[PDB]
Structures are given as structure tokens and as C-alpha cells.
Amino acid sequence: YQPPSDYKQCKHLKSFPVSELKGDNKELWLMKVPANIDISQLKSLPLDTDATVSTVELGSKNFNVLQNTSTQEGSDNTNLSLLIPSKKETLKVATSKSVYFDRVFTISETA
């Protein structure tokens, strides 16, 4: 296999830890957040892990929190898989027994 004309091979990827993943203590979150937000500047993400529709206050901006998982509509994500390298360019689907998502969120502006 050869990639396209202007796409260049990712060689020095950052290692995502998978020891702290599968745990009898930890989780695995996903954030469908708008591109407008600089997540580097963010100091804290104080949201509600046991409610469907809610409001996040991030700095001075009041976003509408929607839990994707706690809506029994798109309850299950067997579609989406996480990749990880074990060498840093050799990304592979994270292992447990195969890792699927738990809490998944989308935060919106004032429509």
C-alpha cells in the first residue's frame, strides 16, 4: 500500500496509555466538542455523568451538554473502536479481553 499525493506518513505519534485503560477503577470518555473551543486552554470540565440534557460552564461560555450513551437511542457503540501503537506509528485496536466506549458527549452553543 501507498498513501495519496499530499498525505505524509505519521511517524512520531504520542503514546496513549492502555494500562490505566481496562481498569477496575477507570473509564473511557469521548467528546464531540465544537472546533471553536481551544481545549488546550481548558483548566476544568465540570459536567453531570448521571443526566441526559444539561449545561456546561467553560470559562465564560455556557454550552448545552448531551450525554450520547445515557440516551438509550444510541445506547451502544460497537461501531467505533480505539487504536493504539505498541514503536509509535504502529497504531492497533486497544485490548481488554477489544475496547468499546462508555460515556460519550456532545456540547453545543445556544442554537
Binding site: 469521548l30 466538542v33 465544537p34 472546533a35 481545549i39
Partner: protein
């Protein structure tokens, strides 16, 4: 020949175009500001049985960003990592 010695990708120097014959002192401190633009991706999964190919939705990579996180319920912390969403398919040549 004029054979190349080294090459830098990462931002370093900033060529400025004012006018012919500018008077710029030493005390004047400059600040650069790179525009935030989440680039596009391609993925290729391979073994001796199946091929796994996928690309990225340009409009999505400009509107909403995706990020993966590890969360300790017992502690209340989030180890966030920015990740792209690649819509892939399965094939075998």
C-alpha cells in the same frame, strides 16, 4: 553542487514585508500567532487476510472536534487526548 545539509518543518523565522528601506529598532519585541486548523487524515489497516481503509470528512474536521479520555470514577480526573474520527471500510486483495 549546493547539496542540502538540514531542513526544519517547525516554525522558527518570520520574514516581514513592510516597504523598501524600513527602520526597525532592537528594543521592538515581536509575537507570532499560528491559526488553529485541524488537519485531515487517512488510515490503512493490513495483515495476510484483510485490508482496512478510511478517510476524514473535511466539513466535520472544521465544525466539531473529537477527543478521547480516561476517567477514574473514584478520583474524578480526565486524561484527555485529541483524536480524529476515521470512517473506514474492510477489503481483501
Amino acid at each position: 553542487s549546493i547539496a542540502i545539509d538540514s531542513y526544519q518543518e517547525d516554525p522558527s523565522v518570520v520574514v516581514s514585508n513592510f516597504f523598501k528601506g524600513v527602520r526597525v529598532p532592537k528594543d521592538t519585541e515581536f509575537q507570532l500567532y499560528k491559526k488553529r486548523k485541524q488537519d485531515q487524515f487517512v488510515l490503512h489497516g493490513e495483515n495476510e487476510r484483510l485490508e482496512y481503509d478510511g478517510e476524514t470528512d473535511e466539513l466535520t474536521t472544521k465544525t466539531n472536534q473529537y477527543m478521547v479520555g480516561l476517567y477514574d470514577k473514584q478520583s474524578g480526573k480526565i486524561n484527555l487526548y485529541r483524536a480524529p474520527v476515521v470512517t473506514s471500510k474492510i477489503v481483501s486483495k
